[PDB]
């Protein structure tokens, strides 16, 4: 049958596996990546943001972005054939159409990739925990690029696809949402950094507990992938960390699951909190502290200092970061300490 | 000999915790820094960090919660001067000026430096290869960067990272206002190091859990298929490589466990090394890329980029950090 | 001053890493296990258990 | 007649310690927001 | 400090309930 014939060809062992998931993955991924490359090289942001953002305009690799559509487009899908561009490729680019193009084709690409991990895992004979773990990247992408702007007034306040544009996003989130104070982001920090830690420490432990299986001073040759014995000593690595740190792994399966658990759990927590920031449901303040500080001008913590900084960010960057607001702050309203 | 018995116990492998000669410094210094930190977090009075007689409360008993609490850094009036207890006329003066900070950070840096050495030491006593301590050097260097190196270059322990959750964020924000560390490629490599480490940690754990060899039923944990010290490997590296090589392409996968584990060590350690170095070199005011007003039109109008939006935000942090401490128009301290 | 101060802190830090690297290896080469652990004479397997 | 689908449950000492740590640390993190 | 009048009970129960859950499970394991 033709379906079983197409299944035969999609699942062929090649250099680059295709699969059924490939019909979704490759065109969408290639179009997301091609759209970013296209815009950072040629496409402006002068009509959406008032910004330059292409190699063609003068920007470098740190300042090019496919920028978000202007606030006035709202949450328009901004389709090429839709009502705003009306099939004009030039105007679609000028209106921000590459942003949704990338975000949407990217979103579907990520679905294709996760389906790919499923598809290959079933063909090869392994459990599908790699695709499970990829949930955390998807949860992050969905919350930050789709949900968060859907919560806000427009796609404009989503992250623009660019290095320095992403940095601005980070800084917006400090000045406006006080994102560092949110315990869901704190749990993400602890899963990202704790993952880096587990990556570094488990790699070092294995490399420094190896058995001597060759006679060479470069110890890599002393492993054959078909071998049956462990290549390092779990007993010795256990005694070391028991005596250095107090506790040590004793179960290799629990250790590797834990390496999945930690950074996956943490990215999911940061998504949750971003979902909250979609609604401006911030961890911005502590009410007890504000009540004390309003009644006691000699009370000063690092929490109250950060808020002064957030207020400075907001007043100093908003007139050009939110240009649809036609903000005009006369100098005397700007918050600033002495001298500076 | 009695000294040889002492030395035999200091260096014993039969101690529940290894002591060792590095430990003869580590244990007292860490205990001192830990006890003083606990007491100052709960009980310290306000500290005049900016040396402008505007004290900053940081302890629990003075109206802080776990999030806002800090041991506050020592005064800007002190600068880089050494300031132990005995240099102060009274405990009251010492607390007002930030004494516990120096006591804690100097004991801690000494204690953690010896922690690193302790790692080499026990490894040598166990017959191990010795480089775990080289990996731990990446967070240690980072701690050195923000407690010691950055104060040296700026000229005051008052610009050290506060020992506190919010204090830390106050450090990151003021740092970005002053040095543009997001636009510095050494912090970017640190991001690439911790993000990548998180990714690879996630990857390695899912790939090995994926290749676990069936040894248990369904009514029990897969973990009980591994027994502490079996000689057989518990997963199938060939199947895991078969999987992941098809995910991308086969030559983008690791078939050598030692080569893969070396990569797991090297990627985060190197990246954290560079980000330690980024704090350590921004200490000497070699700052991140500055692209402000870099793009111009043919008439000469500025055409902003995202860098100029980053600057507007940097400016707003700049004119609000240490809002009373500046009497002159350039931020040179 | 910035250029000279920053470069030599980088060089200094990496040479301290260099010291830790070659020191520990020197110690392990001299003792005879810089290439890994002998399976037939694993030291920890002959020490008693911590508990 | 006894239900044949019953199974004993188990939590070993390590899991108890890891779990108590997860809860204590989460409390230590969230209590500030609870007290607000 | 003018804090939430329910933060104390909230924190106390947030700790106590899952802790007792785990303790219950552990001790009935050790008796088998």
């Amino acid at each position: 049958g033709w379906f079983d014939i197409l299944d035969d060809w999609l699942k062929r062992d090649r250099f680059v596996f295709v699969g059924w998931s490939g019909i979704l993955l490759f065109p969408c991924a290639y179009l997301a990546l091609g759209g970013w490359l296209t815009g950072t090289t040629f496409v402006t942001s002068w009509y959406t943001h008032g910004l330059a953002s292409s190699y063609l305009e003068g920007c470098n690799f740190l300042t090019v972005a496919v920028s978000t559509p202007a606030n006035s487009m709202g949450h328009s899908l901004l389709l090429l054939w839709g009502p705003e561009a009306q099939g004009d490729f030039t105007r679609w680019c000028q209106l921000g159409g590459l942003w949704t193009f990338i975000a949407l084709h990217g979103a579907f690409g990520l679905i294709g990739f996760m389906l790919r991990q499923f598809e290959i895992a079933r063909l090869v004979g392994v459990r599908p925990y790699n695709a499970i773990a990829f949930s955390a990247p998807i949860a992050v992408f969905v919350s930050v690029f789709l949900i968060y702007p859907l919560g806000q007034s427009s796609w404009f306040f989503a992250p623009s696809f660019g290095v320095a544009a992403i940095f601005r996003f980070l800084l917006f989130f400090q000045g406006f949402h006080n994102w560092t104070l949110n315990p869901f982001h704190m749990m993400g920090v602890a899963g990202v950094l704790g993952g880096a830690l587990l990556c570094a420490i488990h790699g070092a432990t294995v490399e420094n507990t190896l058995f001597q299986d060759g006679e060479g001073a470069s110890t890599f040759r002393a492993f054959n992938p078909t071998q049956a014995e462990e290549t390092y000593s779990m007993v010795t690595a256990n005694r070391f960390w028991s005596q250095i740190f107090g506790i040590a792994f004793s179960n290799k399966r629990w250790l590797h699951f834990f390496m999945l658990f930690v950074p996956v759990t943490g990215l999911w927590m940061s998504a949750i909190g971003v979902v909250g920031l979609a609604l401006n449901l911030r961890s911005y303040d502590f009410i007890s502290q504000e009540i004390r500080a309003a009644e006691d001008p000699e009370f000063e913590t690092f929490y109250t200092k950060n808020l002064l900084l957030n207020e400075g960010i907001r007043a100093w960057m908003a007139p050009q970061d939110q240009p649809h607001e036609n903000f005009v702050f006369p100098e005397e309203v700007l918050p600033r300490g002495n001298a500076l | 000999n009695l000294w040889e018995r002492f030395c035999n116990w200091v260096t014993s492998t039969d101690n529940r915790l290894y002591v060792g000669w590095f430990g003869v410094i580590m244990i007292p210094t860490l205990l001192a820094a830990t006890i003083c930190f606990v007491i100052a977090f709960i009980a310290a009075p306000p500290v005049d960090i900016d040396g402008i007689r505007e004290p900053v409360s940081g302890s629990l008993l003075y109206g802080n919660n776990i999030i806002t609490g800090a041991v506050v850094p020592s005064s800007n009036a002190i600068g880089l001067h050494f300031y132990p207890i005995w240099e102060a006329a009274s405990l009251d003066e010492w607390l007002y000026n930030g004494g516990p900070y120096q006591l804690i950070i100097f004991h801690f840096l000494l204690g953690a430096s010896c922690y690193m050495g302790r790692q080499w030491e026990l490894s040598y006593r166990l017959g191990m290869r010795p480089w775990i301590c080289v990996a731990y050097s990446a967070p240690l260097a980072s701690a050195f960067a923000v407690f010691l190196i950055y104060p040296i270059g700026q000229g005051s322990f008052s610009d050290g990272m506060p020992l506190g959750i919010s204090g830390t964020f106050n450090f990151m924000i003021v740092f970005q206002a002053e040095h543009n560390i997001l636009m510095h490629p050494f912090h970017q490599l640190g991001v690439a190091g911790v993000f990548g480490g998180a990714l690879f940690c996630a990857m390695h754990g899912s790939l090995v859990t994926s290749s676990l060899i069936r040894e248990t039923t369904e009514t029990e944990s897969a973990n009980y298929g591994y027994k502490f010290g079996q000689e057989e490997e518990t997963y199938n590296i060939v199947a895991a490589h078969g999987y992941f090589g098809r995910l991308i392409f086969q030559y983008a996968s690791f078939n050598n466990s030692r080569s893969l584990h070396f990569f797991l060590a090297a990627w985060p350690v190197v990246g954290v090394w560079f980000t330690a170095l980024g704090i350590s070199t921004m200490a000497f005011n070699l700052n991140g890329f500055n692209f402000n007003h870099s793009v111009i039109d043919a008439k000469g109008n500025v055409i902003n980029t995202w860098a100029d939006i980053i600057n507007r935000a940097n400016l707003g942090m700049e004119v609000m950090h240490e809002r009373n401490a500046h009497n002159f128009p350039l931020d040179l301290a | 001053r910035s250029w000279l101060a920053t470069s030599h802190f980088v060089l200094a830090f990496f040479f301290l890493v260099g010291h830790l690297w070659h020191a520990g290896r020197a110690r392990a080469a001299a003792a005879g296990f810089e290439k890994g652990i002998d399976r037939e004479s694993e030291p920890v397997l002959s020490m008693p258990s911590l508990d | 007649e006894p239900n044949p689908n019953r199974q004993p449950v188990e939590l070993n000492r390590t899991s108890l310690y890891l779990g108590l740590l997860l809860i204590l640390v989460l409390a230590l993190l969230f209590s500030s927001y609870f007290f607000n | 400090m003018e804090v939430n009048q329910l933060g104390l009970i909230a924190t106390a129960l947030f700790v106590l309930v899952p802790s007792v859950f785990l303790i219950i499970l552990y001790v009935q394991t050790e008796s088998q």
């Binding site: 506790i247 | 709960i42 629990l60 502490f228 | - | 310690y17 740590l21 230590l28 | 804090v3 924190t11």
Partner: peptide, 28 residues
């Protein structure tokens, strides 16, 4: 009273460290 709760939780964590190290389950 918030202080007492913060310090109580910290203290339970230290007590946990103590038991997890010295009264751990011995790996055999």
């Amino acid at each position: 009273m918030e202080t007492i709760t913060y310090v109580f939780i910290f203290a339970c964590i230290i007590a946990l460290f103590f038991f997890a190290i010295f009264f751990r389950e011995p790996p055999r």
